[PDB]
Amino acid sequence: EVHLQQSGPELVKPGASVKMSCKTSGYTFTEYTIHWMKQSHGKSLEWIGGIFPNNGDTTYNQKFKVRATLTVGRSSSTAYMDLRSLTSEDSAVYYCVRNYGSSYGYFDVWGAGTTVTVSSAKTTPPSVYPLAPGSAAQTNSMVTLGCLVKGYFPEPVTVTWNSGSLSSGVHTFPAVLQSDLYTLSSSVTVPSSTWPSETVTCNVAHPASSTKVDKKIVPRDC
Amino acid sequence: DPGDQICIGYHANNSTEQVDTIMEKNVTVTHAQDILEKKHNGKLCDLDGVKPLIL
Ligand SMILES: *[C@@H]1O[C@H](CO)[C@@H](O[C@@H]2O[C@H](CO)[C@@H](O[C@H]3O[C@H](CO)[C@@H](O)[C@H](O)[C@@H]3O)[C@H](O)[C@H]2NC(C)=O)[C@H](O)[C@H]1NC(C)=O
Ligand SMILES: *[C@@H]1O[C@H](CO)[C@@H](O[C@@H]2O[C@H](CO)[C@@H](O)[C@H](O)[C@H]2NC(C)=O)[C@H](O)[C@H]1NC(C)=O
Structure with missing residues (x-):
């Protein structure tokens, strides 16, 4: 309207x-x-x-x-x-x-x-680090995966999981200021059977720097 | 020699305000009061608080 x-x-x-x-x-x-x-x-x-x-x-x-x-x-x-x-x-x-x-x-x-x-301050491109759980403990009924965006300026950034197809169970936390740069994390939570068989990718975008990066969560093979 | 005096009298001024009478039109008076509003502002407005539905 x-x-x-x-x-x-x-x-x-x-x-x-x-x-x-x-x-x-x-x-x-x-x-x-x-x-x-x-x-x-x-x-x-x-x-x-x-x-x-x-x-x-x-x-x-x-x-x-x-x-x-x-x-x-x-x-x-x-x-x-x-x-x-x-x-x-x-x-x-x-x-x-x-x-x-x-x-x-x-x-x-x-x-x-x-x-x-x-x-x-000058514009600073971010940095994306995937978060696969340790091979040691294993979360049973549901597997929690993560994504870490650290050291960027200025706000904001957009976080998606599998280009957006992955939804309700995602939490993207508010950014925080660390040494005059921003830092935030995301937590996608999928059923245990789905991972590592299914491709879980982290799609992050930072407009102010024209940056778009993808990271796939590869399991920790200890 | 002249003797003292007292006079009775009434107000005059530089008013050119004018009123009409059944016997005489355009009589010029010291003071007057307009009671007709001839001016508006050319707009449609909110009324007491409330904007109108202007289709
Ligand atoms: C009572 O007083 C009125 C105001 O003083 C007066 O109105 C005036 O009327 C005259 C003519 O009757 C107008 O004079 C001229 O008006 C236009 C101006 O464009 C011309 O075409 C002519 O020359 C015309 O003579 C005044 O303009 C008009 N005044 C106003 C303010 O409108 C009445 O006529 C008076 N009534 C009597 C009975 O004396
Ligand atoms: C009507 O107007 C006349 C003209 O101005 C006034 O007469 C003047 O009065 C002043 C007082 O401030 C004198 O200083 C001038 O010398 C006067 N001028 C003339 C030409 O006489 C008169 O006082 C006014 N009447 C009223 C009741 O206000």
Whole structure:
């Protein structure tokens, strides 16, 4: 129905500027006002501002008045936001959202989320290491297998098992920061009979570095 | 020599506000009160809170 498709995650040097986009679809662009929400990672939601397409009227939060600049491409049916001279402060997630009616309105359709990271750090490709259990102990009714992605920047990365055909029983843990690089792990759990007969491959992708790698779990032959 | 005086009188000003009367139109008055609104804003709006269904 009413989809708001927005820009992909970005990384910016401190002091620089970003321009994330939001593409509207499913309704008539000029009939509802569009807004932006900032959420400091897993905390609390802040209102930035709003813009009405049809004439380009803007309505800002006191806090964001200087650093922000909402723009609209009517021709393109797309809403833009622009953040000037960033800091660690601004490192958070940003939502493009449709507010229903005017000043006294509710946000009914929330966008995907453009997540921005502010750091002088350089981009670092990850490293994938498969996790086969020791030949010693053997997990009986269900065999747990794993995948380790270590030392990468910036967020995020995508983890799949057998190109996606493998599902419910997979847990991909949130990344953690280790010596200024990210590190996370995944745990696919399949029935004992299925492995090692069936090919269990780890498919990982890191966009910021244009990297896509596969690793197959080969049993530990002690 | 002249003797003292007291006068009774009433307010005047630079008003050009004008009212009509059954016996006389365009009578110029010191003060007046418009009670007709002739202006609107040309838009369809939320009413008390609630956006209209604009088909
Ligand atoms: C009571 O006062 C009214 C306002 O002062 C007055 O209205 C005025 O009427 C005259 C003509 O009757 C108009 O004068 C001219 O208007 C247009 C301007 O485009 C021209 O085509 C002509 O030259 C015409 O003479 C005034 O414009 C009009 N004033 C307003 C504000 O509309 C009444 O006529 C007065 N009534 C009486 C009985 O005196
Ligand atoms: C009506 O307007 C006239 C014209 O301005 C006023 O007369 C002036 O009053 C000021 C007082 O501030 C004097 O300094 C000027 O010398 C006057 N000008 C003239 C041309 O006389 C008059 O006071 C106004 N009447 C009312 C009731 O406000």
